[PDB]
């Protein structure tokens, strides 16, 4: 059918020129800064030396200049032919043509790329270009040039693939082929004449229900990574340069970014004629910034603060000279979304979503891509979600028709949506060709409005502006409620805690010196007193491993050091040196102080003799018995058996052996106890499994009312020897029968089943926590606590939490080491069923003492007349520029109750403001809404 | 997914109003014209009487003639609202509102229609409208009405239907569901204000690759079918009257006819008022005649003569006041096609061809369904191919975007073809609310030239201006040699052979006194002499019967009966009448005359012993055993042996049982000889069968140089008895290998393999003939004359004729009755190859011998210089007005030998002249090409 005789053959087979310059050609090599290798080039004989061929390398760190000085052949005849030079893309780098240096030019775009030297100016200048190690060699030759003949060839070469992406039924495809047909006559003989004539005649071929076809090219950035932040740091600049040569190449073009730190990572490595670039750039058209955020991230971790300062710290760089925004918010690669980003979102006056993987295409209840999101608090979230195709459909793309039907079918609205660019790497790549991309897409389809129109100079300001028109406002509308599930990637999310023990213990001390350092103000006035520059440089440190990548763990070995060097150790080494400094001249009005922060036994016969509770293990076995309650009269059978199953896949994902048994722990155990004591019990039982390995957990907890307390404390110390790729896991079955799960997520208590969703896929279910887990039909149930673990399970009510896990990926830091983990199993009542989620979440503090001379009196209890038991704050923190204060509360039972809301203070005044801090007019409600954040703020 | 919720519930659920006048209406029956009943209406009392109510039927070949009388209601109210009368479509009738009679009206569309009632006119006025019986009772109500409201009826109920035909992928499909959806909110309540703002809305939501689709609506009319022509001569006069309205109605619409005749059947009926009503329709716009053809016919049986008046006879209406034309020639429900139609297209002033069958989507060797048409001849015809949906695709058209993805597929072009109209009745109706779906269509897609417009209204001439501009004038083309092979339906083909010996012998014979008859025109001058007014009365009667549905057989049986009257008998009648009529003021030259034209044994030893050649049936076997000759050496084994397999299909297809064992008729058999001499030699043997009857064939031949003759002929007759669907033939195995086989097409021999094309489907495997069917290597084979059996097969190289077909079809008239049949079995050499071919086809000649009294001298050969035993001369015919003669040749040995032309005559001029008979300035050429016709005028 001739099919495979227009589509292989002219695709394969002045004009294009290769001539070699081999003098003049300088190299150099670092093996122990652009300005600074500047002084060392002229001076002397430097390691810059001659290379004039091929250089060959070896794996290092190591980065390697070079310097290409280049004159310019004759002087009219090749100056009309197109100057390029191509080299091949390295792991990283730098390219320059500096005098002395004015210039920052792009590198780190695919290893297929063009480097235009200008026309402008007649003569001899130089050129500054490094390339990463990580070994790859580089092709270096000066090709000169026509841009006519190049141009026919590039569109016949996304007209064949057109041909072949277009229904073979219809008669374009047949029209296609004899497209392809006619221009391969005139361009097989090697004639430069017809070739220049033969275009002409295609484009005569070519021009002879609305809709809307566009796309934002965008590049998605990791600042940590499987390489390093200091070397991103220099591929991130390489991102902006790619832009400002394209646009005085190509106009309309339009670019997004989703950290607005990257504007001060540049802004701090090029201050001088950068910031004045970035100007007329960003102001006029062209560029715009997704949701201001300082920094993207996974929000099911952290807490809300870590929300409320990449939103507030997002939003200073809108103080300088900036502002040219979008309603847009850019998670692509953050995995999970949090129940409370419909209501974080229309505070900080961000009103659109953005999301790619959590959803699929059929009736779910639940019609198409395009989304209106109504979180469990109740208020709606317009979100536009890309198709299944996510972000990796219009990355690096030359194939035109190939996914533009693929992407119809998930979406209806008015039109579709294309995001040009990769997501995976150092940073994506623009490519320059997108010019005769747009425009020889204007060649296949007519202009004027009938067919689809082709735009991908359209901003997504205008296209909410489309939404607002065409459907209604809507009541019934697309309806998710909470979190959006798919095959969520947990993998090293419980893997590797000891980044989390870390961070997790790093997240509530920067937590903790916040609020009441305000609290000093009165004491000793300079400015009164808050760490209000103190504290902002502490903030910028720790956003930074906080990112969606970073965070969880997944990466290489090398970065993975540099998240257990002071980077998270420093943070809690400089907050316990401030928590030892501001005490001095503070805690000096008390003689001793107990600083806490709030507002208002047997062995044979196998007992720990206490009333409010009792748990047993049985002889040899191993195993617990009988948690049994006397008053509600609930006892357990199958407690605390830990499991360990193997697990064969890398960090990404996490994928089980098929119908593999999970090894038990129950071994010939011996018994012992700690310590004798009213205060002090703990009864230690000993486990070992093949290849012997200690596995240690500890039993604390205290009596009732000589100790006082409701729960239990059980931590377990495990160091890791032998055997890798094994996930270790502790279940904790209740044996009752529940087809709900009460979980408390990132401000507020989301609902969820014990059953996942019919149209999950993957075998194995484990959610993403907080800190505790319940069962509850409000009569009873069984809590638990836990610490450095964020994952657990519903496995039928057996409740599983997940102590550590080993992948297969290239990291060997994941597998073996020390661990100290911690966790706790609580009863639970209907009158304690708000006592329970009290006791879980804040229990991570740490008790300190410390006491001066005294002077004084120690004792003030400084809140005022709120007394809420169903609400709990999270946040209270000062400004930046007055150092006016913010008051954040949220309401923890929700969905039943309505909270009256009496929360006040003395002396000054206070109004209603939003998360980005942002002063706003209804005033402080009587009433707080279930499943509501309440944030308020401070003035003299 | 609500997919029925939204299609099946609007869907089927001032304004319209239904009154009811009883008094007035009368009721008329002849149990027993126009203008006679208007004569017999007001005067006395006669069979038209008082109906008011239902009238009930019975079979029977009446028409009920009906008059409504109607006065229009109040005066202003109901004159706004549209006015109405619905009718229950019967078999057949006229619609009339006479005053006196000025008007005809179109009834014979579909059961369902509509009547305007003139708003214009404020009066009271009469209805006059009858019923073909065949019974079919009539509902007759007055409707009155609003149109706004009924048009949003129709456009949502167009709507949803192309909401299903849509791709469910694409947001169209979601996009006309939300369409269907809000029409259905304000319709549901029945809310008069709410629907006609409703419609409104519905524009507003409707109005927000260069292709076309376009179509003409056609009606397609058998004169001869399951209805009679007297019946169908009333049914062609609602075909015209239904645009009439409509031209008023709605404009740009396009109506075709594929009969010149028809001009003439309404031009005899109503000469008056409606001779006067043609010439502003056809000559502005709006009408065009395809082909100007006299006749719609099976070009395979007859002559080249009957397509030569077809187009002449035909022209003759061009003469009158007529002759806006088209260039293309519709065939559609003609099975099969001749070789020569690409000459005869070219020469007619032709140059388009449309077929509906024959034809499939795949690569044949074959693109597509556009089509050049290159003859053996070497002509090559553009023709336009409708897709494999045929004409019924567009016929009776609601369904809007459902056939239209199915065009586009096996059609390339630039655009589709779409046929309106239906070719299956007593003629195809043309539907009012056309003009609405040009326009709904019009609000689907939007303006302008982008998409695909929506035009109704262009005309196939400029559609083939098109075709000029964008396909390229060619070489390498789409290529198709000789016919087209698809399932042919051969059917009734061989079918009832009697009113094939009737129609074959009176094509013969009005064939006969053509010429001839102009060479009387020395003798008795007045015009000279020839029939030229009387041979043209002969052609109208003879062409009537010979249609593509008439001719092979295939209708009911009381057409059938007017198949065997005069009208096929008359002719023999009448020209048998003028041939003694003629001769005696002529042959009275002739003492004795030869009519010709032209120019220039044992018994138990079994044998008939002569010279030619022997063939022998064996004892009691009734098989012939060996047919050989001596010179040339061949022997056969395997003749003559009659074969008979039953036909379980209907008249249209033949379908065999599934592997039926065919029934031989060698039995017990007898031998005996007719006479005994030298000049008549037959030799009697019986065959007999189950439920026993008489099949006999017999033998006649002349020996050699008394006798003198090449040729042996074999007839059968045949008296049918008992068993039905049975399927008789006669085999003749020739016993040899050939890849090729011999035949004689229309003018011309086509080469045609043994073996069918690897892309047929059906099993059984026939091919319709003229005369005669030869394999032959040139060296030898085996040639088979024939008379009244247009059917053969080949077998594998096993000759077979069909005797008589016996279908299941409703006609009682195919089963039983006598049969007079005959063939022939030739011996074949390379010298003698030329001979066959000349032996075989005007072998049909009957002998005739009269004589006058003798003054005179009766030799004269009157033919000059010509001598071309290549070529032969079918017709040789006068003109119309002068009364110049005409001279076709046509050479029937061709694809070998180029045939030198010294054909010329004396005492006149001579120039070549096409078939329309029309002057051609290339003169006499002196060579004729391979399978060429060549015709020529004579002048004196």
Known sequence: XXXXXXXXXXXXXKRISLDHDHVKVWWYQVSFSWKSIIERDKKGELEFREANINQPFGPSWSTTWFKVKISLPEDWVKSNEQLLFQWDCSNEGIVIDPKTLIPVTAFSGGERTEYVLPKTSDGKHFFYIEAGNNDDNRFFHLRKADLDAR????????????????????????????????????????????????????????????????????????????????????????????????????????????????????????????????????????????????????????????????????????????????????????????????????????????????????????????????????????????????????????????????????????????????????????????????????????????????????????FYDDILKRTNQGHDLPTWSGELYFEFHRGTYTSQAQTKKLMRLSEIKLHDLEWIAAKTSVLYPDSYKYPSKQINELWENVLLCQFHDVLPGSCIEMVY??????????????????????????????????????????????????????????????????????????????????????????????????????????????????????????????????????????????????????????????????????????????????????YETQFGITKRPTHYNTSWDVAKFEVCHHKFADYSEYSKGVSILNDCKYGFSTHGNLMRLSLLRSPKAPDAHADMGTHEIKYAIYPHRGALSSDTVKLAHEFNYCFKYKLPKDIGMNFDDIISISGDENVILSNIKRGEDEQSIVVRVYESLGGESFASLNTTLNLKRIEKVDNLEMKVYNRIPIKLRPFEIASFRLYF
Chains 1, 2 share one sequence.
């Not at 003989?189 to 229900?209: G, I, T």
């Not at 296949?444 to 997504?460: A, F, H, M, Y």
């Not at 195993?623 to 059978?637: A, Q």
């Open 561 to 742: 050091k540099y998240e257990a060097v002071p980077m998270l150790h420093n943070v809690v080494k400089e907050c316990t040196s401030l928590i030892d400094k501001t005490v001095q001249f503070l805690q000096s009005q008390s003689k001793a102080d107990l600083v806490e922060m709030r507002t208002l036994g047997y062995d044979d016969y196998i007992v720990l003799a206490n009333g409010k509770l009792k748990v047993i293990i049985c002889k040899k076995t191993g195993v617990i018995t009988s948690i049994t309650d006397e008053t509600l009269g609930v006892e357990y059978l199958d407690f605390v058996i830990y499991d360990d199953k193997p697990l064969g896949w890398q960090a990404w994902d996490t994928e089980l052996y098929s119908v593999n048994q999970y090894k038990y722990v129950t071994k010939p155990k011996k018994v012992q106890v700690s310590c004798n004591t009213k205060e002090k019990c703990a009864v230690e039982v000993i486990f070992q499994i093949s290849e012997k390995c200690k596995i240690k957990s500890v039993i604390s907890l205290n009596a009732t009312a000589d100790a006082k307390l409701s729960k239990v404390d059980i931590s377990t110390t495990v160091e890791n020897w032998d055997a890798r790729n094994k996930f270790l896991k502790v279940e904790f079955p209740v044996n009752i029968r529940n087809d709900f799960a009460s």
């Open 151 to 462: 141009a026919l060839y590039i569109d016949f070469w996304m007209l064949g693939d057109a041909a072949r992406e277009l229904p073979g039924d219809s008669w374009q495809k047949h029209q296609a082929r004899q497209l392809g047909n006619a221009v391969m006559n005139l361009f097989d003989p090697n004639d430069r004449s017809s070739v220049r004539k033969c275009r002409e005649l295609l484009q005569r071929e070519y021009f002879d229900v609305l809709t809307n076809v566009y796309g934002i090219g965008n590049c998605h950035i990791d600042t940590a990574w499987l390489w390093p932040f200091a070397e991103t740091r220099r591929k991130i600049v390489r991102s902006w340069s790619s832009q400002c040569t394209l646009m005085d190449r190509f106009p309309e073009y339009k670019f997004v970014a989703s950290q607005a730190q990257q504007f001060k990572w540049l802004l701090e490595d090029h201050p001088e004629f950068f910031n004045k670039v970035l100007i007329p750039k960003i102001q006029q058209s062209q560029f715009f910034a997704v949701g201001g955020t300082w920094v993207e991230n996974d929000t099911n971790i952290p807490s809300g603060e870590s929300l409320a300062r990449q939103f507030f710290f997002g939003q200073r760089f809108f103080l300088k000279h900036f502002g040219l925004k979008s309603k847009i918010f850019w998670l692509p690669d953050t995995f999970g979304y949090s129940s409370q980003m419909p209501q974080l979102c229309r505070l900080s006056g961000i009103d659109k979503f953005l999301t790619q993987k959590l959803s699929w295409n059929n009736i779910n209840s639940f019609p198409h891509s395009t989304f209106n999101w109504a979180g469990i608090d109740g208020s709606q979230l317009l979100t536009h979600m890309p198709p299944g195709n996510t972000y990796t459909a219009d990355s690096h793309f030359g194939d035109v028709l190939r996914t533009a039907k693929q992407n119809k079918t998930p979406e209806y609205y008015g039109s579709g949506l294309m995001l040009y660019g990769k997501g995976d790497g150092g940073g994506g790549p623009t490519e320059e060709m997108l010019q005769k991309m747009r425009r020889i897409r204007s060649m296949n389809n007519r202009n004027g409005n009938v067919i689809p129109k082709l735009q991908v100079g359209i901003t997504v300001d205008e």
